[PDB]
């Protein structure tokens, strides 16, 4: 009963040739109309959104806190001697900072020299297209001392006492608000509380906090945070080649051959946290410089 393939009375795979053509033609027209309908409705959907602002922005309420060495498990395990052991790290750091070189930020028509001191926020009008392409404040690698250097094509970084810079999640129209001068026990920090978003790193328990001896922060003018003069963001369409602020963190006194956990928590009123997302506001890392 399963050899209905053909017969002398015309059937193929179950039906005739004229029937195969009728069915195939119908399905082509039907699915063609279905495709045209889905495309027309998806076009109306595209017409319900603008080019300068996402309609819903509540799912990114607390900005994240990422790092340069996008590790497979947020762990930094390498050998202070073997250059190939830490190649995966340095490669990502150089590729990340490749857009921050002095040669990359050379056009004066799209770049604006903000300043050597963190200042107040810079609002470039509204988010519409009435104004031209907004300017992006420059951020030279020199601001991150001891984690930038004037190295060649390969940024000879720190083998012993590594460097891990932190970055605030770029959010459109987001205005960072640092904590009030009434700081609720925020771990020794500079008095530049009004024009910089503070970020403080620490261990995770009584063990990690003891293994991590000394940490040195680097930023704009020497402040451990992000300057307010670089916010808010006006989208990729209006601000292409935008350079968000960076802040490096170096762990000088580490206990070699020991995996220790570090939590870099960014503080502020407009900075939320989440017990489910260990990256919202805070940031974790597992460093282990095994010799």
């Amino acid at each position: 009963k399963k050899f209905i393939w053909n017969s002398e009375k015309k059937e193929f795979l179950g039906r005739t040739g004229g029937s195969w053509f009728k069915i195939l033609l119908f399905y082509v027209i039907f699915y063609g109309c279905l495709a045209g309908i889905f495309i027309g409705t998806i076009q109306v959907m595209l017409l319900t959104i603008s080019e300068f602002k996402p309609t819903y922005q509540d799912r990114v309420a607390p900005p994240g806190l990422t790092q340069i060495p996008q590790s497979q498990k947020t762990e930094i395990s390498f050998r202070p001697n073997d250059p190939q052991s830490y190649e995966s790290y340095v490669v990502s750091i150089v590729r990340f900072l490749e857009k921050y070189k002095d040669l990359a930020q050379k056009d004066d028509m799209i770049f604006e020299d903000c300043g050597n001191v963190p200042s107040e926020l810079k609002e470039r009008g509204e988010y519409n297209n009435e104004r031209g392409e907004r300017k992006v404040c420059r951020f030279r690698l020199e601001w991150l001392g001891n984690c930038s250097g004037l190295n060649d094509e390969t940024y000879g970084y720190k083998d012993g006492k590594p460097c891990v810079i932190i970055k605030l999640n770029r959010v459109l129209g987001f205005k960072p608000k640092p904590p009030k001068n009434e700081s609720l026990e925020t771990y020794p920090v500079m008095k530049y509380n009004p024009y910089v978003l503070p970020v403080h790193c620490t261990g995770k328990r009584d063990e990690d906090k003891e293994k991590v001896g000394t940490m040195e922060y680097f930023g704009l003018g020497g402040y451990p945070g992000f300057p307010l003069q670089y916010y808010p963001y006006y989208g990729k369409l209006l601000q292409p080649k935008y350079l968000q602020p960076l802040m490096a963190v170096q762990f000088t006194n580490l206990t070699m051959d020991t995996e220790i956990r570090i939590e870099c928590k960014a503080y502020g009123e407009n900075i939320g946290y989440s017990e489910k997302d260990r990256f919202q506001g805070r940031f974790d890392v597992k460093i282990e410089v095994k010799s």
Partner: protein
Amino acid sequence: KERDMDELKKEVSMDDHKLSLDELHRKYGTDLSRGLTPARAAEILARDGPNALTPPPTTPEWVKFCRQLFGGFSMLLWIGAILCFLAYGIQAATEEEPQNDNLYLGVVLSAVVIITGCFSYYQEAKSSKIMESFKNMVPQQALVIRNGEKMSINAEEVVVGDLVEVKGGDRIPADLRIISANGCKVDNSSLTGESEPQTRSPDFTNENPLETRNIAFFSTNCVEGTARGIVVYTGDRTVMGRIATLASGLEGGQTPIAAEIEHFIHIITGVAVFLGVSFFILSLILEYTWLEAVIFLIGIIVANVPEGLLATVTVCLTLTAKRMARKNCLVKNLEAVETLGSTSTICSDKTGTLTQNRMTVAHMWSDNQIHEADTTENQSGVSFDKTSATWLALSRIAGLCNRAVFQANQENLPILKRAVAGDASESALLKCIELCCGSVKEMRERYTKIVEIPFNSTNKYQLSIHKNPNTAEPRHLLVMKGAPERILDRCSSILIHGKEQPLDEELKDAFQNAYLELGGLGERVLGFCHLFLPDEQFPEGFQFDTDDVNFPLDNLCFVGLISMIDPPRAAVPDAVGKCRSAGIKVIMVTGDHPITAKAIAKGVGIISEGNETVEDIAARLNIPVSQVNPRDAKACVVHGSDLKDMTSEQLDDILKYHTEIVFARTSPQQKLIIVEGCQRQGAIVAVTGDGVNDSPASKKADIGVAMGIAGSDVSKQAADMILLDDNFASIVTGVEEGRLIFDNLKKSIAYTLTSNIPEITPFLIFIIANIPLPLGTVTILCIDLGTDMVPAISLAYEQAESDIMKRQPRNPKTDKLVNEQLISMAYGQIGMIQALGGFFTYFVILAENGFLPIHLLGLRVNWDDRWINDVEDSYGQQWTYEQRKIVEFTCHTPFFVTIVVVQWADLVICKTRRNSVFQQGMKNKILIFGLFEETALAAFLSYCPGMGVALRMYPLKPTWWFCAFPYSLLIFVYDEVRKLIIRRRPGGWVEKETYY
């Protein structure tokens, strides 16, 4: 070697009955008037086993429970669950932080099969739980003569070769060889099917042990008189014993509904493996390795298996089975409820099934006029004219001169169903006078009987003289009854409206053609007469001692004849008409005499009025039967005497060219062969019987239909459906509900098969376009095992779109449950719109949150990564892992809601296969609740506090509930115009390709 054992039972039985009295006693070593010594009796008792059929093969409850966990459909969910743990075995060992979705899925599939097994098992076991409440097996002791003395012992304590005596009313224990009888009439109804009480005489008569009268049979009752017999067969070796053992040892077959289940899976997996394999090849062509491609093969195939369809189908069958139980039409099998709808040939039994198996007064003769009496079991028919002197005289002759009365407890029972002691003929006469002529109690004691003359072995006449208490005439009233040929000789006067007339041939020949009318109708005719004795020649003190001529045998006044026969049940003829209207070929199968079988078939509808048999054509032309052409006779009678010498091909030819067939005098084994012959035609056969001869026919039949009270216990257990009310119209109700649930199952199947496309397409393009997951697993379970449960079940409550009792029976090889038309609509068109609607809501949510639909291409590579917490969207924003994963899960929840939205219209369109929604109408209240529950439950699964915590289903922004609205409306429009064109164009395009 049990094959040979079954072949020795399908053979017709043999005996050693035809032997001299001395030969039988020597072969058995038994005294004829004394039996045997009790020690000899106990010696055989502990030799071959007590006289009782071996209990049925007990069926332990764990066996049938594990039975419900297997089958054909549940087997598909089992291999699917195994593939889930197999896929999980490959996934766990190979990837990091594996997800608990596949393991969650494997255990859920296992739970689905288990719960379905428990629910279906509870229903099948409930049918048996009420069936065990019908075993009212009352122990019946037998009267055996041993050591020259009479003794009453249990039937099991009876052995072979000993004298056994039976009284009128006693049930024959084992098979006896009558040695001395005295007016003994036995009831061979429950065994061979002989309706009228067949008498038993010690003299050997026919070569067939069934027709001969020197044999008493197992499970047969002695109607009247007494008789003696030597036990020949005992226990299971008995006649009905070998029949019962044969029924238990016969195959049950494959139900038509189960065959549709098998053909259903043949396509479900055919496309599942086609999609899985073709996509497995595609995935390896792209970039996915063998490790991941194997999981893709399993995921695509496993998703294409409707998990919730097993439970919905089981409940869908259970609902119709519930209605069967409401009308006292129980089904021992949960799926046997469908078999009636697929039936195209019903093999019915005459005695007990079609007929009431009880002698009843059929017609009366008065004033040269036939008067039909009411013969309905419930007494709801036409009443004759009961206001004439001819009627009062005839009624008095019957009510008075008749050896029949009621019993003790027979006081509250109805006039017909109550018990009467005596001859079956005398019992019928009593039930008719007690119903149409007041009461026979006072009507009998009124005319005081002086001297009676019972029936005689020759010239069978029964007369008696009574006193006349009328306040006008003191003359004695003599009454007599007998065969018309035995009373015409003893009559000279004729009664008409009150006055007498001579035996003029102008009315006497008119009496002969009427006698030939009732006789030709297959009934038993009797003649009643009376006469006024001259009190001047026989004073009030003269005692008419029964010796010499005290009553004038001749010169009597004849009033009229009274015929009688077992009538068909009340709703039997109408039901036969409904089945033939439905296209079901009705075939009478019985062991009764052909003279009555042909007449009963004429009266129920198996034989149409006007059609002639092969014999009828010859008699109409006064020519031999061998000359007529059998093609000229649409109907034909088949005797068991000729069926024995037949081949399979000959029986096929009888069924092919004869539309109305009646099998008479067919042995129980021949009943089995007849059913096997109808099955060779490939048509679905249903057997409706009651006696033990119907056990081998009902068991092998696709569905056995037995009588709840008037049916023997053996054929009642071998059947698949029982009629506790014995209303044969339940067969018509069964065929109606069978075709009804079949088409409703098609609708429910297409509904669950439609949701499959939007359930798998997200995961398909997830592999192709490399976009984030459009729909999650847990969200799919909320559809197949949550919301859609109510619409699928509510689709069973759908009524008929047109008259189902007007269409012809479905061809098994043609009208399949699931064909390429249903799939062309569910998987091809309707489900396709549901899939695209889901993708619409998918792109809508992502684009409104900053992920343009064009930007989502190739994003799953970094999207599914857990540590890349800065993935650039379309506006330049950076999304963390949970920030974007929350969006993905809150994109699965509205996708699930999108499914419910398109399922609104999908439910309304699947509700009607051909009629418009305006024609059929939204009167299905369960379906209305199906929409309300499905919708409200869907909103609960998204807005309850903690859904995004347990089921990872986050709340929806209110604008998503309308992203899928036009898709449902479009589905409704396209399917509505489709069925509209099916209405105006019943030709081919919209009917052969889309209609299913």
